[PDB]
Design a binder for these strands. Structure first.
Ligand SMILES: [Ca+2]
Ligand SMILES: [Mg+2]
Ligand SMILES: [Mg+2]
Length: 430
DNA sequence: ATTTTGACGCT
DNA sequence: AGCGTCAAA
């Protein structure tokens, strides 16, 4: 009771751009705005693979990973924007640069952890304390929270979505204890005010809309974010966790969407996150290991301590290309030419990175896949990255992989290569 | 024949 | 160091 830590010590937000690559293309081409549209890579095979989908097109059932020919079967008027191709491969530069726009805006408000090209965690604890001091116990107006949902509300004794949103927000604000600067619910509420301001700044200065979750840790913030998409933000309080988790499939919590979450379900014979509360910490550790067991015991109670790491820039810079089916590289000069294309894109991005961010990569990671291999990577080998030189980098990658060739033949390559991947890693300040 | 990414844990 | 997991668009 009095010594039971409740995981209410921080205010953490997760901001995620809505249908991000689509929004980048729609900002560039106004003909695509407010339309069912998608972003596609390549075009020859089945119209290209869809990698992002507007909410208008999602209403027709269009999804990511769909071939555009099939998506057009669901959505005959679907508009498409193609990823740029350079040196024979898809090139994501436009989206990386849009991401920088958004991340630099967010960093004005607080320390951020770049979580992916279009999402960042925000540690708002300090900013919240300062805003609380400036407000002088003044109550928080619903007008400061015009796109915020309070998960779990309204409850107790309208048929429209905005009307529900407002009633729950009213109930929340009417219950708030604003005279206590230490109340975690008030801190989350002020966090939500700041996130409204952050999201307005992002939209004003880029045109991009986003959603956000606000809660006491990264996992709950990430979950909250997805509850009301697009263009809305959701506050998940500590008190909301029991009800929220009671029907929440385990696979919806970050890191449990894969094999571990499957084993939790299988071994324990449960379906929802809240059912985890009925096991002791030692039981969970026995099944899933010391670290996972401790994490699960705390997480099913809404508690998690993983910090928002101060890192706005990616730690690796990589280029990769698949060679599916019959395109798999079967000659030496094929392998070498594609290694060079990858190395040239890598050198461009690396030189830009060094100029912008005062750092130099020191290691080159070469990874390949062989035809008929189960895994995504069949082999991974490192070498020194000493010069931002695409010919040297491609030569060194070839040197470290040349020995994979089972061909007794000079020119030929066997087994054929279905994937090449060059990654620059191990950055040092420059 | 989703493809092209990025972070982190285990041994 | 190399492999595997989990996740983004
Ligand atoms: Ca997104
Ligand atoms: Mg995202
Ligand atoms: Mg997504």
């Amino acid at each position: 009771g009095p010594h039971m830590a409740t995981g209410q010590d921080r205010v953490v937000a997760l901001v995620d751009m809505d249908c991000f690559f689509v929004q980048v293309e729609q900002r560039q081409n106004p003909h695509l705005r407010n339309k069912p549209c998608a972003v596609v890579q390549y075009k020859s095979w089945k119209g290209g693979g869809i990698i992002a989908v507007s909410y208008e097109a999602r209403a027709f059932g269009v999804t990511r990973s769909m071939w555009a020919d099939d998506a057009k079967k669901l959505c005959p008027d679907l508009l498409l924007a193609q990823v740029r191709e350079s040196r024979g491969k898809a090139n994501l530069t436009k989206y990386r640069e849009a991401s920088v726009e958004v991340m630099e805006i967010m960093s004005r408000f607080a320390v951020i952890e770049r979580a992916s090209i279009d999402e960042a965690y925000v540690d708002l604890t300090s900013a919240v304390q300062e805003r609380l001091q400036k407000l002088q116990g003044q109550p928080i107006s619903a007008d400061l929270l015009p796109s915020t949902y309070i998960e779990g509300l309204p409850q107790g004794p309208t048929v429209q979505k905005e009307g529900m949103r407002k009633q729950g927000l009213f109930q929340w604000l009417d219950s708030l204890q604003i005279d206590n600067l230490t109340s975690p619910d008030l801190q989350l509420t002020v966090g939500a005010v700041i996130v409204e301001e952050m999201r307005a700044a992002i939209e004003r200065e880029t045109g991009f809309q986003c959603s956000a979750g606000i809660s006491h840790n990264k996992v709950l913030a990430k979950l909250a974010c997805g509850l009301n998409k697009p263009n809305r933000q959701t506050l998940v309080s500590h008190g909301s966790v029991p009800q929220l988790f009671s029907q929440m499939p385990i696979r919806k919590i970050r890191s449990l969407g894969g094999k571990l979450g499957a084993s939790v379900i299988e071994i324990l014979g449960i379906e929802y996150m809240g059912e985890l509360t009925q096991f002791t910490e030692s039981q969970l550790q026995s099944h899933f290991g010391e670290k996972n067991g401790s994490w699960l015991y705390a997480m099913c109670r809404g508690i998690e301590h993983d910090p928002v790491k101060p890192r706005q820039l990616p730690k690796t810079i990589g280029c990769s290309k698949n060679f599916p089916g019959k395109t798999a590289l079967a000659t030496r000069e094929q392998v070498q030419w594609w290694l060079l294309q990858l190395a040239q894109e890598l050198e461009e991005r690396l030189t830009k990175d060094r100029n912008d961010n005062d750092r130099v990569a020191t290691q080159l990671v070469v990874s390949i896949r062989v035809q008929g291999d189960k895994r995504l990577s069949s082999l991974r080998r490192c070498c020194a990255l000493t010069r931002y030189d695409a010919h040297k980098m491609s030569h060194d990658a070839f040197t470290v992989i040349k020995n994979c060739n089972t061909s007794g033949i000079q020119t030929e390559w066997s087994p054929p290569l279905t994937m090449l991947f060059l990654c620059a890693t191990k950055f040092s300040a420059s």
